[PDB]
Amino acid sequence: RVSSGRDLNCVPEIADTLGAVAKQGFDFLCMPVFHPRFKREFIQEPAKNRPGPQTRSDLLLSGRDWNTLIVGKLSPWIRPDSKVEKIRRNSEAAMLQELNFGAYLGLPAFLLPLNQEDNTNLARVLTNHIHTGHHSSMFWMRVPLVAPEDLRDDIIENAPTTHTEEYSGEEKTWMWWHNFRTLCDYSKRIAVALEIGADLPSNHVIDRWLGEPIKAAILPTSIFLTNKKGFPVLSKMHQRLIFRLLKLEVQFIITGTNHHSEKEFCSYLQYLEYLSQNRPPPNAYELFAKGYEDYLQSPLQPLMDNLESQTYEVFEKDPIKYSQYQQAIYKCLLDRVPEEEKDTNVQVLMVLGAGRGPLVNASLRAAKQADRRIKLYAVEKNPNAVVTLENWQFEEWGSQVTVVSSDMREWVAPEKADIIVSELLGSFADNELSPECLDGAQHFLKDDGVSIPGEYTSFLAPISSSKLYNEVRACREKDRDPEAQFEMPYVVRLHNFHQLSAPQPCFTFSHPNRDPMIDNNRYCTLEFPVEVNTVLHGFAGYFETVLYQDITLSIRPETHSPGMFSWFPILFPIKQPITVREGQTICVRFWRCSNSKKVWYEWAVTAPVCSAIHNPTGRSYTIGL
Amino acid sequence: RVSSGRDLNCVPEIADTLGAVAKQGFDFLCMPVFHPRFKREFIQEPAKNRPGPQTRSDLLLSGRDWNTLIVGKLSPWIRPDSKVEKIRRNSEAAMLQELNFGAYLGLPAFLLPLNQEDNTNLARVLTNHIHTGHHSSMFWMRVPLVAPEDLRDDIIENAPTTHTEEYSGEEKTWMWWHNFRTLCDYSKRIAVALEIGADLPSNHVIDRWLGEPIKAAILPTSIFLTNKKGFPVLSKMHQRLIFRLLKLEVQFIITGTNHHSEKEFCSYLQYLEYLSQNRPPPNAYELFAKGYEDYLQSPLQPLMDNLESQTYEVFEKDPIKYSQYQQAIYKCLLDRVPEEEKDTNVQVLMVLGAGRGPLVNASLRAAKQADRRIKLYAVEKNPNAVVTLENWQFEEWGSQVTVVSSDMREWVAPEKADIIVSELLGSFADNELSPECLDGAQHFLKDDGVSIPGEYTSFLAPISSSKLYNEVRACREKDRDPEAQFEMPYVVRLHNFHQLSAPQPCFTFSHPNRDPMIDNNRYCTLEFPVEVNTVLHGFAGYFETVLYQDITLSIRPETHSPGMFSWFPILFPIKQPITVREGQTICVRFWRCSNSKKVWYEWAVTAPVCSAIHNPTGRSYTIGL
Amino acid sequence: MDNLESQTYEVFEKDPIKYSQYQQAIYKCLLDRVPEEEKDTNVQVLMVLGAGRGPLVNASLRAAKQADRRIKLYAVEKNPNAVVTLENWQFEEWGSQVTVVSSDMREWVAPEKADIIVSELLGSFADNELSPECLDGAQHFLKDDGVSIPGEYTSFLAPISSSKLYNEVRACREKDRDPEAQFEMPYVVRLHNFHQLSAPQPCFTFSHPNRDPMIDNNRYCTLEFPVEVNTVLHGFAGYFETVLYQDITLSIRPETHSPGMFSWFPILFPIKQPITVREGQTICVRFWRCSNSKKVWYEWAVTAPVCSAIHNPTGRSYTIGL
Amino acid sequence: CMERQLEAARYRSDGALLLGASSLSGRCWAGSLWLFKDPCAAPNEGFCSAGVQTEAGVADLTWVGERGILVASDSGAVELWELDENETLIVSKFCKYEHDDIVSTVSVLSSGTQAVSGSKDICIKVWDLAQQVVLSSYRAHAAQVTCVAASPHKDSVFLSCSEDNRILLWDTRCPKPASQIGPGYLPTSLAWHPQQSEVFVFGDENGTVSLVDTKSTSCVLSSAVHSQCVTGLVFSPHSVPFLASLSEDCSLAVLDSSLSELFRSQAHRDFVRDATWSPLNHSLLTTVGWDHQVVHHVVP
Numbered sequence A, B: 001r002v003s004s005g006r007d008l009n010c011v012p013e014i015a016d017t018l019g020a021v022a023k024q025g026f027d028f029l030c031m032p033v034f035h036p037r038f039k040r041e042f043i044q045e046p047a048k049n050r051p052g053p054q055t056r057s058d059l060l061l062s063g064r065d066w067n068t069l070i071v072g073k074l075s076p077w078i079r080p081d082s083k084v085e086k087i088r089r090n091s092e093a094a095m096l097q098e099l100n101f102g103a104y105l106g107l108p109a110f111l112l113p114l115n116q117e118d119n120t121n122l123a124r125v126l127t128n129h130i131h132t133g134h135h136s137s138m139f140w141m142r143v144p145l146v147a148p149e150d151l152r153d154d155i156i157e158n159a160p161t162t163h164t165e166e167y168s169g170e171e172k173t174w175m176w177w178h179n180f181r182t183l184c185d186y187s188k189r190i191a192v193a194l195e196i197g198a199d200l201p202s203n204h205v206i207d208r209w210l211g212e213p214i215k216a217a218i219l220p221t222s223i224f225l226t227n228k229k230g231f232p233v234l235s236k237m238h239q240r241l242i243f244r245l246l247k248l249e250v251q252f253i254i255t256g257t258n259h260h261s262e263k264e265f266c267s268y269l270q271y272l273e274y275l276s277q278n279r280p281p282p283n284a285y286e287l288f289a290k291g292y293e294d295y296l297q298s299p300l301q302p303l304m305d306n307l308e309s310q311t312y313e314v315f316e317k318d319p320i321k322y323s324q325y326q327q328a329i330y331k332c333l334l335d336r337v338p339e340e341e342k343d344t345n346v347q348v349l350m351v352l353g354a355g356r357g358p359l360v361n362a363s364l365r366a367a368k369q370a371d372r373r374i375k376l377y378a379v380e381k382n383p384n385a386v387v388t389l390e391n392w393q394f395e396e397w398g399s400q401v402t403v404v405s406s407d408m409r410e411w412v413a414p415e416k417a418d419i420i421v422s423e424l425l426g427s428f429a430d431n432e433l434s435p436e437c438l439d440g441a442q443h444f445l446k447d448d449g450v451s452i453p454g455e456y457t458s459f460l461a462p463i464s465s466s467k468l469y470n471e472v473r474a475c476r477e478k479d480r481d482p483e484a485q486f487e488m489p490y491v492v493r494l495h496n497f498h499q500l501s502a503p504q505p506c507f508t509f510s511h512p513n514r515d516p517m518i519d520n521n522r523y524c525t526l527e528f529p530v531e532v533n534t535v536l537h538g539f540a541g542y543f544e545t546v547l548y549q550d551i552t553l554s555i556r557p558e559t560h561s562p563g564m565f566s567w568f569p570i571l572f573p574i575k576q577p578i579t580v581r582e583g584q585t586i587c588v589r590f591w592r593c594s595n596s597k598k599v600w601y602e603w604a605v606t607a608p609v610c611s612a613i614h615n616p617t618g619r620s621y622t623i624g625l
Numbered sequence C: 001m002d003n004l005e006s007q008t009y010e011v012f013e014k015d016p017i018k019y020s021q022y023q024q025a026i027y028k029c030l031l032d033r034v035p036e037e038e039k040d041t042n043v044q045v046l047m048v049l050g051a052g053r054g055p056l057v058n059a060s061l062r063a064a065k066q067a068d069r070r071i072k073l074y075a076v077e078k079n080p081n082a083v084v085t086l087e088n089w090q091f092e093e094w095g096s097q098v099t100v101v102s103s104d105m106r107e108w109v110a111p112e113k114a115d116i117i118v119s120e121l122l123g124s125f126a127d128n129e130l131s132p133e134c135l136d137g138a139q140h141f142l143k144d145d146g147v148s149i150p151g152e153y154t155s156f157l158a159p160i161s162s163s164k165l166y167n168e169v170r171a172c173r174e175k176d177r178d179p180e181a182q183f184e185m186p187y188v189v190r191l192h193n194f195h196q197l198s199a200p201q202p203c204f205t206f207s208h209p210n211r212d213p214m215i216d217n218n219r220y221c222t223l224e225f226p227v228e229v230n231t232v233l234h235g236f237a238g239y240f241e242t243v244l245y246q247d248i249t250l251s252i253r254p255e256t257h258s259p260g261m262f263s264w265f266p267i268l269f270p271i272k273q274p275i276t277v278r279e280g281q282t283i284c285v286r287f288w289r290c291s292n293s294k295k296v297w298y299e300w301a302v303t304a305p306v307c308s309a310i311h312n313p314t315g316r317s318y319t320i321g322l
Numbered sequence D: 001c002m003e004r005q006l007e008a009a010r011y012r013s014d015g016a017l018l019l020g021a022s023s024l025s026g027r028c029w030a031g032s033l034w035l036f037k038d039p040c041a042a043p044n045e046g047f048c049s050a051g052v053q054t055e056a057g058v059a060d061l062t063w064v065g066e067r068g069i070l071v072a073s074d075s076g077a078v079e080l081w082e083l084d085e086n087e088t089l090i091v092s093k094f095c096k097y098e099h100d101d102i103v104s105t106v107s108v109l110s111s112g113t114q115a116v117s118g119s120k121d122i123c124i125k126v127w128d129l130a131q132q133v134v135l136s137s138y139r140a141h142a143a144q145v146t147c148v149a150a151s152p153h154k155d156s157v158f159l160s161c162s163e164d165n166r167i168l169l170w171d172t173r174c175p176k177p178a179s180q181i182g183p184g185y186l187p188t189s190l191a192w193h194p195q196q197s198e199v200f201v202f203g204d205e206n207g208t209v210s211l212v213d214t215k216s217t218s219c220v221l222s223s224a225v226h227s228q229c230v231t232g233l234v235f236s237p238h239s240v241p242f243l244a245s246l247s248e249d250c251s252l253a254v255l256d257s258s259l260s261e262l263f264r265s266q267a268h269r270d271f272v273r274d275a276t277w278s279p280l281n282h283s284l285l286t287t288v289g290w291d292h293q294v295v296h297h298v299v300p
């Protein structure tokens, strides 16, 4: 299904017009609330006292129809940034009037254009309207991919079009948006209605937009080609852009008149639905992740708190993760004891952090797969899960598995293990304190012992997203620092964002740590080449892990384990967005800090401009040991 | 439908038991998460190291079944307020353990008993559990109407029951609750499971409870009588209490064994459903108000802001209000001009605040009803509604009605009116600035002119409600006074509350104000006799209004206009609850204050103890002029 | 909304330059309004709109004794505490000549019309103390040929650099309000540890009497400041100039500052986030003077070299009660 | 009834008056065309020779000969309506929806068989009225086209002005037909000089009327005539014509060759939308306005 609307500038009868466009199959109608040619005077007489009514009556539709089917359009003659003072004042008054009438009607969205560089007074009036009264209407800024001045025909003799390429010039429209939403202080009610032209711009211009809050994509009828049978179609690149927009779940607005006059008007919408039905099918990960798009999740405590039963239940259903663990254990058992010893040698395995016992059964299956003998310990610090473990050990496992209700850092082991197995990795690998736990546990690992995972590494990549920046900004809570929400990492299925550079490794940990001075504190500097103009809002974080030799897991996008839903990326925001030009380098610095009680990250951007050192001394985010 | 559960203390097989009680028709099952007889040691050996499992496995049910069908019950041997220190420590540890296991299972509610006076350490442990981790389980404090010590048989020779009556003694159980929830600081997750005995207490004890957060009513099988056919039934007073509880939408828990052993167990639940189907049918007001029960609504601005279209649409559908207005206008027209003048005399009517024109059509109908001539002005300050008015005047009304887009305080009238009609009354009558508006308008009323409404009066009544007190407490917002939410009135369909005294008149206004020094500032003192022990949390506010002679409107409960949904009561909270004993008098003081820009209320309780003067100088709530 | 304290009048009464300039303005106006052959036949109606404790009243008396012309004095004051001082002085010294009027000039129904109205309602940003609204409410009892002193005034803005003052504004965060409200209000401050980045340029201008049928004190202005150093912008300093009468002027603008005049310190419009400016770049700022029936406030935003957020929208952090 | 917002008034050679009106407020946003052979009786609906209702409002119109009427519609359409042979009915001939927005201006070329249309869709289109098709579609402007005006004698020459602050002289004989004639205030109205085929006049949104000689890109003369936007400019039929200027300040002005004011009228109470000179009495000037007034002025 496609949420699609019809844009019109001429509505003689609202009932007739709405019925017609609904019979065509559209879901909403973008129309003017005042007659677009009906200019109104507010200051000087006699036009000041023009007898009403000023527009059509709200009684022509029901409240539900107004609330669900009508999008308002600002009258085109309203120009608050005109250079004539009279026109400025009249446009201010008329813009306030039309916005107040849209709020009166309860319109879900209102359309305002960005068709020039200077929209300062427009932003002033819109911000004042937003901070006046109690209304919940969205505001769609209509902005084109290519400005009309850069689309005009080259038919003016003494004013030819500059055929030379300008990288930032062809991006100017984005700046029109960026300044506007900057003047309005990133209001969550101000979104983008992106208008697509006949000729698409270069790729970088289109790359800018996809991290922005696009709620609507406007498709004029003039951009539709004609196929062999006469139906309106789109070019292949337009289809690619439409697919990308469908992933963003924007609403599609069809404007202009019917140019394929042999066919009816519902053919354009039919072609849109055709593209939607013929979109690339989603993979298993995209199905598991549907619903979590750009949903922020605050930091949890892996040691201070205990996991709930439903959490184990859902994260137990990841077949790829546990099949990889089983393969790692199987290869390790085969490489640790030969076939001539398959009966004489029993291997001590210790599942450090067993939960409800998925790695215990993985070890059992790997032993039945390698035809080797194992002796199993299942250590778990969560007593609620220890109940599950002990019930399973009484009903199924038996003598082979020994359940140990303890912290691995606290457990005095009766013997030493040949293999220790754990799944303590967070989204940033070490952000759930796997190094500290495995360091506290490695004293009962044999001198020739093996840890699975063998090693892990975190990765960082600068991202651009007004959506996620606004989502983090909306996390301000009473009774704490008004900027503490920017000094903590979030787990989030990143979606409406723009990755600015390739992910680069940040922190690395190995087990057993063969160093006499085991120090898990870290300081790392990363340089990211940026080859577009953009606005940096934070750093996405992934990880990779070597379980055993070639057996690996990864949420890094380039090497992502197929269909593995257990880990979403992490997000380190920054308090203030940072402008980056083409060719500039984003230099960021990350610290892994700790004391005897807690562990936390600190991070700061040092190029192209310096940010404040975020989360100093863990004042906003720590991980309890 | 009735949301009903089965209480049990013996569950051999959770699958079998849940299937059986679900086949009986219950919606949930109250059971123990540990075996109630399975006492556990936490300090001294050897019982400290008892091998597990400590309870049954969470895998016996699915996550959804745990989350929707199981209520946990604290083990009966757990006594945190015991006088033996060993028992205190073991009960603290075991209570934390069982609450953490209930949170692990994701149980929607957990049951804890209040069966003695001192539950201080129980409250300490429960509060610490509430402030530990991230869980969303409700906590049902099981408390009886009559304590078991006051229900025991008089069969102890040397310890007879005191047959003398004690007013506060027979209320002791409520105190058990009141202290507990007071120690826990009115936690929204701590509710009451009220247990009903065979013999109901006197009426006042039952009166205490109905303002409290009761989420469950527990009905033992031993309290059910036996009718002529052998089915379990209840007494008439028990049926009355069950009806009152059904209005509160509590869940009903059936406990005890089957004592009507000729019938099955579903007969008790069948009788409950029978009572629910045979409940008194709701009136029109209760139907219109269903959904708004105890929903707080912040103060609006009748003059600073403009009303939305849907608001006019919904408040236009009140036939009683506008029929009363029509009758008032009709009687006034008949009493202002005789029949011999019915053609020679045209009456100037001015609807000061016309909106979309319901009073305009009411005046037209009243003129067609009295056979008199009228000249209509429709003054409205909301331009969005002026659009509706002018469209109606062009399509229907015509020359008779003159639409005036202006504030009545600002409008220079061309002539004087015989009758001015308005509907500017809020829930507290004058809280929407009807006096100021009509004072600014009465200069173009004829010296013999009539205002409809002729007069109005506000009423106040002290109320008791932990529910609404918690709802107001939850209105604390960042970036303002942490106690500003207590210094403003709310519009709310009061429901889970206890009216403590009869409503008494507060402020009165008449129109035209025939006084040379028109002063709308007021100071009033009200004394309310209280004939129960209770806790005061605020003052409910109603109003009455004389539109014309005997034509009246009222939201005062004793004289409420039938089926009129336009006005909900108002609520003036107080920052701190005030204890009131039987026979004491609640003395409250209310000020109506104003300057040139705004109007606000100030209020303070002066007996039996003094509160702080609420909303001084309008620092938390004003009504813009 | 508030009334001035006695010590405030006491200290701001001791500015000899300001009141000598006012006296000179009144003297020149009296000489230019009535010839010598009329010096005895013509009495001039003077109205001190906002008299306080009566420094402009005595200035008018001295200017009349200096020009040898006759005057009839009204001293209008809305602060009753100062009206006590005025009435005690009128009983002890002034007498029949001065009529004390305890009222707001916007509310006072004048018995006659004035030849000259004199006021000192100017703040650090000229119109930030609502002199335009007050004089507009008062100019209905000014003669059609009447004179207002001050005749006109103009505000000036200049971008500044100061980590000191930025930190001082940051330290003004208070509980129970917007954590960034302290950046959305102007401060009066003797600027010191700062760097003026460009020359001051005029912002808003007001004249009295306003000879326009549609008297509108709302304003929108755009200022472009050439910057010839690398720097960090933290806010905008504000000054003012005022023409009391013809060549008689007052000014806190640094280039034309009235010598030894301590009555007005500069004003400071901060911005929430510092803005980096390179050599040769232009700081483009925009200022709005907004109002409704109840209050007046300023809104401001930087639009070059990068955009700031529109500061103090709809007066959510700072208003001037009417 | 007749829609209140009277939009266009045009005198025919024989003396009749053509009125185009639109409903810019109320329930229905349509339009209508009217022909009065008695012009003094306008705008009475019972005193007209012919009248018809269109589907949308009339943003602009112009005569096409003696019986044709070309209409720019709010619906994005250009529609030709032909008058009756008894001149008692106005019947639609064609109605083509070729613009993606409101068609705001139309002008018949000197041959009388082709037209030029401008719209808020930023494009200008050349129409062959006989084949009822679009010959060419140009997108030279960067904003909505405020006005187009065909040259009175050259069939391939016309002027355009848009909100991109561009005034364009068009000769469709060149591979690049548009030429820019110079940034102050936006141009709104265009009027060719009836005798000098290389002189025109343009009004701006600020109330100024300027006279331009196309040989030298420089304002020969200009004058602030109105306080608000100059919405129209019409020359008189005199041997040496007078210039009628209408504006949103609700006033009509009549200027001479040097843009000096000879007549000033405030008879209108709303926007003055069109003025037309009587071919029978050259001192008679009929103006229409959104106050639904049809005023007949006697210009000295």
Ligand SMILES: Cn1nccc1COc1ccc2c(c1)CCN(C[C@@H](O)CNC(=O)c1ccnc(NC3CCC3)c1)C2
Binding pocket: A288, A289, A292, A297, A307, A311, A312, A313, A314, A315, A316, A353, A354, A355, A356, A357, A358, A359, A425, A426, A427, A432, A491, A565, A566, A567, A568, A569
């Ligand atoms: C021992 N044992 N016994 C039985 C089962 C187990 C394994 O128990 C666990 C328990 C928790 C976790 C794991 C294993 C590994 C992953 N880890 C990820 C966190 O570090 C960060 N969160 C996310 O990334 C996240 C958040 C929300 N939804 C997500 N995915 C959606 C898509 C449909 C589900 C992902 C949490």
Ligand SMILES: Cn1nccc1COc1ccc2c(c1)CCN(C[C@@H](O)CNC(=O)c1ccnc(NC3CCC3)c1)C2
Binding pocket: B288, B289, B292, B297, B307, B311, B312, B313, B314, B315, B316, B353, B354, B355, B356, B357, B358, B359, B425, B426, B427, B432, B491, B565, B566, B567, B568, B569
């Ligand atoms: C002139 N004109 N034209 C067309 C129509 C009109 C009349 O327009 C209005 C508009 C608003 C109001 C009135 C009339 C009178 C009542 N008044 C009550 C407020 O003072 C306080 N609110 C409540 O009590 C309240 C809140 C929420 N829901 C409630 N009831 C639910 C039960 C189903 C609806 C009640 C608001």
Ligand SMILES: Cn1nccc1COc1ccc2c(c1)CCN(C[C@@H](O)CNC(=O)c1ccnc(NC3CCC3)c1)C2
Binding pocket: C004, C008, C009, C010, C011, C012, C013, C050, C051, C052, C053, C054, C055, C056, C122, C123, C124, C129, C188, C262, C263, C264, C265, C266
């Ligand atoms: C009618 N009447 N009768 C008797 C006396 C009067 C005149 O009464 C007044 C009262 C107040 C004001 C004035 C006149 C004019 C100046 N105005 C300035 C404000 O707008 C802004 N504040 C500053 O600039 C400021 C703040 C603090 N200290 C400053 N200077 C220090 C240096 C030693 C003093 C300056 C306040």
Ligand SMILES: CSC[C@H]1O[C@@H](n2cnc3c(N)ncnc32)[C@H](O)[C@@H]1O
Binding pocket: A302, A303, A307, A352, A353, A354, A355, A356, A379, A380, A381, A382, A385, A406, A407, A408, A409, A423, A424, A437
């Ligand atoms: C699958 S998430 C990691 C699992 O190991 C457990 N765990 C985490 N840290 C420790 C620790 N230090 N000692 C024992 N178990 C742990 C957690 O309770 C969870 O079941």
Ligand SMILES: CSC[C@H]1O[C@@H](n2cnc3c(N)ncnc32)[C@H](O)[C@@H]1O
Binding pocket: B302, B303, B307, B352, B353, B354, B355, B356, B379, B380, B381, B382, B385, B406, B407, B408, B409, B423, B424, B437
């Ligand atoms: C039915 S709620 C009261 C109605 O009267 C209007 N109203 C309220 N105050 C005034 C006022 N002072 N002048 C005119 N209309 C008013 C409101 O906009 C609303 O339509």
Ligand SMILES: CSC[C@H]1O[C@@H](n2cnc3c(N)ncnc32)[C@H](O)[C@@H]1O
Binding pocket: C004, C049, C050, C051, C052, C053, C076, C077, C078, C079, C082, C103, C104, C105, C106, C120, C121, C134
């Ligand atoms: C010298 S500061 C301005 C002086 O004029 C007074 N003033 C300010 N506004 C008004 C007003 N509207 N009407 C009368 N006096 C005023 C103040 O109280 C102060 O004394």
